[PDB]
Amino acid sequence: SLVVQEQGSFQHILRLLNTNVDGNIKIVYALTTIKGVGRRYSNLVCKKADVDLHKRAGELTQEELERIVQIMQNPTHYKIPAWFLNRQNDITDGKDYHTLANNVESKLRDDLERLKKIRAHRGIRHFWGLRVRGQHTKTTGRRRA
């Protein structure tokens, strides 16, 4: 009974936050293809923004897409719990963030550089490129390429 009779307003791959978002896949997994955001946070974002879960990403057009993107940038104001974000109790401010498409790589490099500048053993391992978690490199880690 859920056949859709729309003709023209469907669209192919689209743009959202510096990422090529696929247009003929489901909305939650297209948000997953956006970097810095996974399946569970995407599903939560769609349900909380009252966006139609059932179908693809051709319609679910602009105004709901900016509802999506603004609850992505400011999650804490709309009863998204503090532990659901990826970076909480931060470096120098203590306020909870969610890093997105470019900021995730920029800030992982930033805190790696922080630990390199404080001259941690973790920094020494990340500098040599070895396994920084406690792992046995005697037998694994071959063919780094």
Partner RNA sequence: UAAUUGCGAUAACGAACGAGACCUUAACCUACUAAAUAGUGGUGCUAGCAUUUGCUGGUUAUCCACUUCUUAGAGGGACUAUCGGUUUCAAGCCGAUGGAAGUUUGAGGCAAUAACAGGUCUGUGAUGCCCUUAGACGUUCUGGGCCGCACGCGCGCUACACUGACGGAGCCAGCGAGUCUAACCUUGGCCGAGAGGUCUUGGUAAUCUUGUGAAACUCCGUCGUGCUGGGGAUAGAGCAUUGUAAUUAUUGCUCUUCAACGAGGAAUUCCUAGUAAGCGCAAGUCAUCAGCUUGCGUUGAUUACGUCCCUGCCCUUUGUACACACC
Give the range of 37-45, 90-98, 106-114, 137-145 binding other proteins by CB under 8 A.
Answer: 37-45
Q: The tokens of 107 are what?
A: 């800030």
- In whole angstroms, the minimum distance from the beta carbon of 120 to other proteins comes to 26
Buried b (16+ CB within 10 A) or exposed e, 83-94: eeeeeeeeeeee
Can you tell me which of 14, 44, 101, 112 binds other proteins, judged by CB under 8 A?
A: 44
Binding region for RNA (CB under 7 A): 25-26, 29, 32-33, 35-42, 81, 83-90, 99, 104, 108, 111-112, 115, 121-122, 125-126, 130-139, 141-144
Residue showing tokens 């896949």: 25
Binding-site partner at residue 58 among other proteins, RNA, none, CB < 5 to 8 Å by type = other proteins
Binding-site partner at residue 10 among other proteins, RNA, none, CB < 5 to 8 Å by type = other proteins
CA 95 distance to own-chain centroid: 18
Binding-site partner at residue 7 among RNA, other proteins, none, CB < 5 to 8 Å by type = other proteins
Is there binding between residue 79 and other proteins (CB under 8 A)? Answer: yes
Can you tell me which of 13, 18, 20, 47 binds other proteins, judged by CB under 8 A?
A: 47
Distances (CA, A) of 72 to 9, 40, 47, 62, 67: 25, 13, 13, 15, 9
Residue showing tokens 């993107």: 69
Binding-site partner at residue 37 among RNA, other proteins, none, CB < 5 to 8 Å by type = RNA
> How far, in Å, CA of 79 to CA of 64, rounded?
18
* 84 versus 97: smaller Cβ distance to other proteins: 84
Which residues are CB-contacts of 38 (< 8 A; sequence separation ≥ 6)?
32
